[PDB]
Structure formats: structure tokens, C-alpha cells
Design a protein around this ligand. Sequence first.
Ligand SMILES: Nc1ncnc2c1ncn2[C@@H]1O[C@H](COP(=O)(O)OP(=O)(O)OP(O)(O)=S)[C@@H](O)[C@H]1O
Ligand SMILES: Nc1ncnc2c1ncn2[C@@H]1O[C@H](COP(=O)(O)OP(=O)(O)OP(O)(O)=S)[C@@H](O)[C@H]1O
Ligand SMILES: Nc1ncnc2c1ncn2[C@@H]1O[C@H](COP(=O)(O)OP(=O)(O)OP(O)(O)=S)[C@@H](O)[C@H]1O
Lengths: 342, 327, 350, 217
Amino acid sequence: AADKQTLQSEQPLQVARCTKIINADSEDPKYIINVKQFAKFVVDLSDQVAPTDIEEGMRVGVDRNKYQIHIPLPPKIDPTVTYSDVGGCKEQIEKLREVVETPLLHPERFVNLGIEPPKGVLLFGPPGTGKTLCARAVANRTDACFIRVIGSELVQKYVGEGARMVRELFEMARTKKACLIFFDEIDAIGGARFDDGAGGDNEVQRTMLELINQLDGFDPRGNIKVLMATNRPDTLDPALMRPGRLDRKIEFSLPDLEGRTHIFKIHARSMSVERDIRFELLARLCPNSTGAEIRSVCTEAGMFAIRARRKIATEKDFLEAVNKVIKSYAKFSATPRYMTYN
Amino acid sequence: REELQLLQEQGSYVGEVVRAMDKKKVLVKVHPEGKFVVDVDKNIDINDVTPNCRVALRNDSYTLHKILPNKVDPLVSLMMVEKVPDSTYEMIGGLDKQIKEIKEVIELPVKHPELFEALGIAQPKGVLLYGPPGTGKTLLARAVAHHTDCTFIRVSGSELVQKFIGEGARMVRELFVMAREHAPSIIFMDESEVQRTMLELLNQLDGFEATKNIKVIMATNRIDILDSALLRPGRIDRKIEFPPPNEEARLDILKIHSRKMNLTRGINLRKIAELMPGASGAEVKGVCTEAGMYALRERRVHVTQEDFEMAVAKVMQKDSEKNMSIK
Amino acid sequence: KQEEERSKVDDLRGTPMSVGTLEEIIDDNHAIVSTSVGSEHYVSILSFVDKDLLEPGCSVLLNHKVHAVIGVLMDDTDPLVTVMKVEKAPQETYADIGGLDNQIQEIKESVELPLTHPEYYEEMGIKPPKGVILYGPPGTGKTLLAKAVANQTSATFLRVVGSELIQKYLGDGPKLVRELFRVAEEHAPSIVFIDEIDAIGTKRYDSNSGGEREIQRTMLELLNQLDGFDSRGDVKVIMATNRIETLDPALIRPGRIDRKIEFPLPDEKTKKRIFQIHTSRMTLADDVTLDDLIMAKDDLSGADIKAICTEAGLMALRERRMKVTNEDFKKSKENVLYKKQEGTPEGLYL
Amino acid sequence: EAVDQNTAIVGSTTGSNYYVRILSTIDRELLKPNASVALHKHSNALVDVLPPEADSSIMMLTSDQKPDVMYADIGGMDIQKQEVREAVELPLTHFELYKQIGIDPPRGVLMYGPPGCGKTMLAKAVAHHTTAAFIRVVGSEFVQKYLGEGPRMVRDVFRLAKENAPAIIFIDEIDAIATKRFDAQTGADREVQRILLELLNQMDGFDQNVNVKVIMA
Ligand SMILES: Nc1ncnc2c1ncn2[C@@H]1O[C@H](COP(=O)(O)OP(=O)(O)OP(O)(O)=S)[C@@H](O)[C@H]1O
Ligand SMILES: Nc1ncnc2c1ncn2[C@@H]1O[C@H](COP(=O)(O)OP(=O)(O)OP(O)(O)=S)[C@@H](O)[C@H]1O
Ligand SMILES: Nc1ncnc2c1ncn2[C@@H]1O[C@H](COP(=O)(O)OP(=O)(O)OP(O)(O)=S)[C@@H](O)[C@H]1O
């Protein structure tokens, strides 16, 4: 009973049903609310509130008897959002150097020649290829800053909540200088305006409009660069294909052979192997593979290096690792077992 | 009769108690609603709270007031569905080794539970009597387990496969409460709430049984190609098919469905059974009925053999069609 | 005395009391409560109960009329925790070596040896396997090997069936995921086992809400909880199925589940041992040759061998014979397999 | 259900379930099924019980909507006409000509032929000639949303059928709702499954005194 008497004084002070906001009229507050389950409503406010902060994508206090608007806050928040080896793909970091580094170093080549600074890139390539590494490998030279954002993190079940996190990311971006948010799975974020008379997946729609608004147009970017990752330039918008926003389209695909030797260097140096072995034979054994699968190969040679007590990996450890992954774990073991060839 | 203002306040509903806790409180979870913890009345005990037994909650202040029997009540909704007291042995004629299999699987747990429980395990639980639907399977199973007279209460268990099963069924184990409080009975079924109910069967009939296995039976058609998560041999013990009945069985069923008729002396039934190609059970009855129809269109009281042969020409031709023997 | 303070707390309460699911801290002790159906006034809390026992968004004791928070919820004994929290380390590690021997070694040096000696990753800078899907044909040993690692252990084993998470209430299953991973968090280094999550994908019910919008949310809570944040560290979780078609690939991807392990239906060289050991504890007329049964069924599981080796003795002891005739093995195998069709084809290699 | 003397449990059409004190007015055995009972608005108590309910959505057309067609009004359907007469009207009076020969009562029937043979015309005429309670439905409304909905329709028809009489009741559809393909997880499989299982499991082989000759064509 540490506060029991005051609890017998709050019984005449009780208000404010949850009631998320759909939208409003114009010229006036005149908002529109669904409660949860019943119906819809075209509401108006109580007088002692701020009609400013009753904006769309919010859940306000609402009276029982008059449904008049009381004080909001964001009642849906915080759990909502989950480089020495610079040199992976080759022709890519140089175009990365261009579109990122050259506006962030000099407005000398750009404004004087009469062009606008290229500010955004459409990365495209298969997954497991190092979009994350090149993205973060930008952040050695800027200052140190990076944030990572998967697209389907914004799949949360309230209207404009993803747009609210667009608000959050763009008002964290301008707090800091020379920073890097990263984008990925930008198809579910939306590039195509699919519509018929259904009214469904619309938080994506208004969040994507919020994305076009805060991205480019109405106080542009400055010392903020954001890469967008995909397998397709096919499911995007012609409003960010507005030709001065995302105009480079850096290309890469599976590495050649020597790229895989470089990734062999990378995931050989960062673990316990022996420094007397080669990798080009293993590079021949990987005609189509990813550096993520090179990580799997190196961790599997580490699994053999667990099997026997090995901290100095032989060539045979990586031999049986590749033999494990590409021929004895590609599906089972028995695509070989015939000569006809040798 | 003046007391009946007691009527005029309270339709004090049936309450749903999971279990009670200390400090004179319970857990009542009202019938389409959620958890509401309250105090109890004075004329029932915290001791009187049985695990998952319904109560009589007055809705004054949700005073936990009285406790009610019968313990589930979708129960008699299924117990008022069985109700088929059918006929006798002599109209079966021919699945007789399958009748001895029915003896082995059913009648010995009826007569002697501890002549299979003396072996050390439980009993079988099903035969999966598949085949062409309607060979007298209804007649066979219902008749032979009709004459046990108190150990087979054919629930049919799937007539509303979408409404008996899950739409009121807790975890259809109202069926199992029936199987335990009518410990001499039998469960009959047809075809993912069906899969969940399969998994609660596997919670029970995988060697964890009160009244011995009871006897859960489904029989399917068209090809035994339901979802194979039911078809492990440790889910349905025995599996018995129904062949097309043979010349002996067609003859026996022919005597069965010819006996009650107005009979002409000087007939040869074997000839008619030889003409039949082994159809699935009672085209015997089709020939008998259409010969009665030929006697109906005409006017006779003696049913000769040529009338049956005309009925054979009716319901035996097509399949027909030669210049096709080849093979 | 204490009695009057306790009575005044009890009369802060109003005897019809209720229960509602929350979302978020409102730090200055006034709160707001969804119900099941969510009607949410700016409520208080009865300030002698501990508000800070609990993390955001969980059931508490409420009122019906002013909706205010009253007490902490009871630690509600759902039927899961008694099954989820594995009571004893049961039995059956290996009564009989010679059933798999391929992925026994694999499950050993992938589940025991990283966990029971977490000092090899010190030398070689390797991450442990978090999730491994053990799968294959039905009746192989997946549940068996799960129990084998469940007894042969030094970690607090946990065992979960995939249909334990399927209840008709709204948000019930996600709460069961929450309490499930509380159980997975708050024992020890632990070996969670999950079974039957291929019986969850093409599955809809009648004791149910909107079907594709019910366990999408539950398995999405599983997604956001299992290998999301709330740092992984050392918590062993094993999931097992029979088929892989109904699996969302969002969980099959790395980060969440590393190793993919099938199981072959075994060769005849180990069928002889599995048929022998399943027949090791009965009386049998030893003239009969199981090599017929061993060579016959071309894709036998061990439940096949189980039902055969027991049901032949059942057909013999059916008429009270201790030892089994070979045609009782015929009757047994032709009961066990519906239409034992492995002869020609083929049959006629030959 | 009833707990005790003159006090029982009723669910309602309001959504929830209730436990009610019931009067001595209704006889103590009139409450075996989930029968149509009457309660109070305010205070929820039994007054009366009505044993039947649930007409079949048009209920037999009741008067006149027999299309007024005779036997010879049909041009040429003589085997179908004549045999339907033999298996509908001659059984309807002469139950005992099926007893001195000892045959069977009737069930449904099947027709076929090209579109334009007057396929509904026979049903028109046999509805006209008869005396019975010609409850009709049609087929393609059986494909509906909720669980067992059309199955509930079939059981409404059957319970009302056994409530009226074994008189004559009628359905005219076979095609494309009840094809022989049981085996396809291809769309509305809940509905396809419940329709197929409902047709077979209410067919039952027989009900033996109800619903004379569902004619399918
Ligand atoms: N070209 C490359 N050069 C160096 N390392 C590479 C390269 N490609 C892949 N890798 C390695 O493999 C990993 C690939 O996994 P991540 O980049 O972390 O995830 P990801 O799948 O590449 O991200 P996405 O799908 O491309 S957005 C990298 O982190 C490196 O460890
Ligand atoms: N010690 C052992 N070593 C190897 N195999 C064994 C051993 N003990 C039993 N077995 C076999 O392992 C099988 C285990 O069956 P389970 O895997 O439980 O079948 P299952 O439960 O149907 O699998 P599902 O379908 O994925 S749930 C038994 O049928 C035995 O034949
Ligand atoms: N043999 C006929 N001679 C003359 N008019 C006919 C004949 N058969 C049908 N009609 C006409 O068609 C009506 C009945 O035809 P229906 O019985 O409905 O044929 P139908 O059922 O529509 O064919 P289906 O069902 O698509 S195969 C009668 O009222 C007549 O007007």
C-alpha cells in the first residue's frame, strides 16, 4: 500500500482509448479513426490538445463518450527495427569510389562542369557476392559510420509505422556526418504501384512515397550515402529512376578465378591454417561458387581441423573441404563414380 | 410459483475452469472470452475445484458460485449421432474369413482382454476395410459388431468433418471421453484438423490406453492415397482389404437375397452366379430387384429363373462388347 | 499492522478482475492495457505490486470497470512447460551401435564437441552451428537420435513437438514462443529439440482463426525470436522433419540454420543387424532366413523392421506359438506394407 | 444439457452459452436434441420449445409452381417417363406389390442425354402428377465459403425431410460438383472434400424411408 491512497484518487481521472489514426480532412483537424475491430469514424478533437501532432500513422487518446482526441505519443515504438581487404570485385570499388567519394571530396569536377553530383547507386548482383563488404568498405574513409537495414524489418502491422521508421532513419541521418545506411530487399519496400480495387498492402505504398520524399527532393542529402541492393532493376519506380538520383548501376556477378583466390587469401588469413599451402587448385575446384561458400569451405576445412587436432591446415584439409561441399554436400555424394573421362 | 422472480436476474452461465490457485481464487476463462480471476462463494470448496470441470458462474461480480457436472458438453451432441441398430448374420454370406479376422481383432478383446494382455502388450485397433464402397461393408461391420450388443457404438466420427472435428471439439477427445466412459464401445471414422486429431490419436493409441485399444476404424476408397502421415504401421496395426466376392460368395448372397422373395421351384442360382463377373457384393440384389421390377411391369407372383436372367441382361450387360478378345 | 495495508490493497482491487496483453513501457507508472479484444484506457498500476518483474508486453491482472493494472500474472502452467522442460535424462543413447554410424559421428562432433568443449573455436576462430535440420524418410531414427543426445548429454535438454504451438486463441502461440524461449534461455547451456515442423506448413484447422494469418504470425515470432537478436551465444537448438517442401526458405538460409543433414535408409549390411536386434529379445525357430526380408523391401525404414519383427511374433503368439514360422513372416510383412510390390520390377536384371 | 431438476444449460443465437432455470411447463423429455427453444430477452429463461425448424431456403414451392405438365404433354421420353412412373408413383401407392414379391423401396436415379432433350421437363411433369411435398434445391449453390456449409444444407434438407414424410423430395444436379476425381489439392479442396464426403456419407447407401428419387442428370 505504498501509494494506495492516491490510487483511491485516480478513480475520477481516467480517459484515452487507443484508436489508431487513418487520415484527416483538409482546412481543419477533422481526423479519421478506426478503433480496433468495430468500424471506422471521422473524428474531431478535444480542445486542450495540439492539432499539429495528430498526424497520420499514430494512435491518439480518445474519450469513451465523445471519442474526442486526447494526447498521443508514439504508442508503437522501439522493437520495430532489427577494412583491410578493400578489394573484392575490382571494377566496382572504383565506380563506388566515383559515386561516393567524388561528391564527398570535391564539388570541383561536378558543379564547374555543369553536372549534378551522383548521389545514389543501384547495386545488382547475386546474393553472397559481397554487397555487404563493399557497402561497409566505403566506411573506412568517410569517418567510421555505418548502419545496416534489411527491407523486411519494416514489415510491421500498423499504418505508416514503416513510414515512421523512415522518419527515424532520415532524422538520424542528419544528426551525423558522412554516414551510411544500407538498403536491401527493396522489392517488398516497393517499386511498382500495383493496384486494383482491394486496399491491401498500402503501408508499403505510403512508406515508399515517404521514401521518395525524404530521399531526394526537399532538402537533399549532403554527407549521407545509402546503397540499395537487389537482383533486379526491374521492379523499381521511375520516380527514383528520375535520372539524377540512382544513375550508376554498378555491375558484378560471380567472381572470375582470381577473385576466388583473393577470397581464399581473406578467409585463410583470418583463421588457423598453415602458411605453406596453395589455393589455385581449390580455385579450379570452384567453377561456380560464392565467397560466402568460400567461408563455408574454410569453416569446413576448420571442421576437418577439429576432427583431427589441426591448427595448421594442410592442403588436404581444404581438399576434403571442397570435396565435402561441392561434390559430397552439393546434394549427397553420387554425381561422380564413373571414369569415361580420365 | 412465487419463487420464479429468481428467474428474473440470472442466466448464470456455465463456467470454464482450468484450475484453481491459492488465496481463495480460481481461474475462470468464460465461454467465448478470456482469463478472469475472481473469488469463490461459500457453498463449494477450493477442494471442490476439479481439474477442468465446468462451474456455474453467476455474473453479479463474477462470483464463483456453483460447480456443474457432465464435464465437457459437446459430448451428447456426438452421442446423439450413432443410433443405427441394424440386422443379423445370415444376410452377410461370404466375407467369412474376414469375419474370423473381425473375431481376432474385436471379439477376443471383448471376451478376453488378458489373453492378449497375457502376451505383454495391448491389442490391435483397426483393419482399414478398404475396397469398392458398399459391398455390404456397412452390413458386415454393423451386423457382426451389432450382435456384441454393448461394445460397438458406431460414432461415424466424420460426418461433419469440418464441424464435429474442431468446431466445438476441444481436441476431439470428447470422443475419447466417450471411449472411456463407454469403455465397451468402438469408434468409426472417415477422412489439418483431421491431422491434429490424428496426432491426439497418436497421443492415445500409441500404447497409452485405458480400455485396451478401443477400436478406431476408417475405411477409404478410390485408391488408398490419403496423406501418408497416417500410414505408418505403428499407427494402424492391421490392414484388411475387401476382394470382389467370388462364385461361392455370389451364390451365398444370391440365396440370401432370393430367400425372402416369392420363389418358383426349379431354379439354378449357380448359373446366375456363374454369369456374374464377380461384382462387388450385391449385384445379386440388383438382379433380384430388377427381376422384381420385370414382375412388377408384368403381373406375376411366381418369380421364375428367366425373369432373373432378363434382369441379368439388364444389369450385367455393359460390361459387354466383344470383337475385343484380343488378350 | 500489515493486515490493514493488505486489506486496503485487496480493496483497491474490485473482485471481478481481468487479464490483458500489453505492448510497451509507459515509464511513469500510468499504463494502457489491451485486452484480448484491446480496449485501452490510460490505466494505472496498483503500486505495491512489482511492475519491474516483467519485460515489456506481457499479461498482468486487470480490472473490468476502470481497467487498471492490479497484480502480476500467475506463472501460468500451460501444458507445454511440463513437456518442454525435459524432466529426466531419460534412456536410449545407444543400446545397439550399427544403425547409422555416419551422422552419429557428425551429430557428435557438431553438437557435443563444440558445446561440451567450447575451447576449439579459441584456436581456429570458427562459429558454432546454431541450427541443424536432421531429416529424411519417416521411421529412420531422428526422434531416436534426438533422445540419444538427450540422455548422452551434459546440457539441459529440451524437447518440443511442432503441434504444441497450435492453439485457437489470439496471440496464444506467440506467447508460447515467448515462454518457450524463456525456457530455452533460463536453464543452462541447453539442447533444444524441435520436431514436426513440416506438419505446420500446408496445415489449416477448424479450432482456428484466419488460417494463413495465424501461424504466419506464430512462425514469424519464431523467426524474430530464434535466430534474430537476443544474442545467440551457446544455445543448442535442433529441428527435425521428414519432408522439406512446406519449409519457408527464410528459415532455411544461413545465419539461422547452418548444416543440412539427411539420413539414408540403410544398406543390407546394417539391415542384418537391425533385423537381428529387433529380433534379439524373442523366441524364434532359427531355421528361417531373414535375408529374404532383408533383401526384399528396397526402401525400408526401421519402423518397417520394428513392425515386421514384432508382428511376426504377434502372428505366431496369436495362436500361442513361441517360435515363428516363415509364412508368419509372410503374413507380417504383407500386413505391414500395403501391396509389397518390389518384385519384377525387378526381379529381372537378373 | 440439463444439470438437475428444472434447471439447464442453453447456448443461444447471441453467441455465448448460458445456464438457466427452466420451468415445469415443458415436459421433462422434450429437450433431447439441440432443439429450437424460446428464452427471455432480459432475464434468459425457458418458456417453450419448438421441435421442428430450418426450411430449405425456398421449401418445396408449396402451392402451384409445378409447371403444369402431364405425361403425354412430354413429347417422347417414353423409357425415362415410363420407368420413372414405375419407380415413383407405383411404389407410392403399392407398397405391398413390393411385399408379395418382396423387392425393395426406392432411391435416386440417373439420367443422361444431349442438351435439348427436355431434361428438366420430366421433373416438371412428375412434380405435377404427384401429391407429395416436392422439396427442390439445385446444385451450384452448394459451393460456399464456411466450414461444412453445403454439408449443413444437405443435413437441413435431410432432417426436414425425415420431419415431413417419406413423401417425395428432389434434387437435380450431378455435374462438376461431384466428379470422380477425389485426388487433387487444386483449389477449394475443403469445399470439394466436404461436397464429395457429404454426398457419399449422406447417400450412406440408403436411408430407406425418405426423399424419393433424387434425380441426377
Ligand atoms: N567478392 C568478394 N570478395 C571478398 N569476400 C567476399 C566476396 N564475395 C563474398 N565474400 C565473402 O562472403 C560473404 C558474403 O556474405 P555477406 O556479404 O555477408 O552476405 P551477402 O549475401 O553477400 O549480402 P547480399 O545478399 O549480397 S545484400 C562476405 O561477407 C565475405 O566474407
Ligand atoms: N540404437 C539405435 N540405433 C539405430 N537405430 C535405432 C536404434 N534404436 C532404434 N532405432 C531405429 O530408429 C527408429 C526410430 O524411429 P523414429 O525416427 O522415431 O520414427 P518416426 O518417429 O516416425 O520419425 P518421424 O516420422 O520423423 S516422427 C526405429 O524405428 C528403429 O528401427
Ligand atoms: N420434347 C419437347 N418438345 C417440345 N418442347 C420441349 C420438349 N422438351 C423440352 N421442351 C421445351 O423446353 C422446356 C423444358 O426443357 P428442359 O427440360 O429444361 O431442357 P433442359 O433441362 O434445359 O436441358 P438441359 O438440362 O440443359 S440437358 C419445356 O417447357 C418446353 O418449352
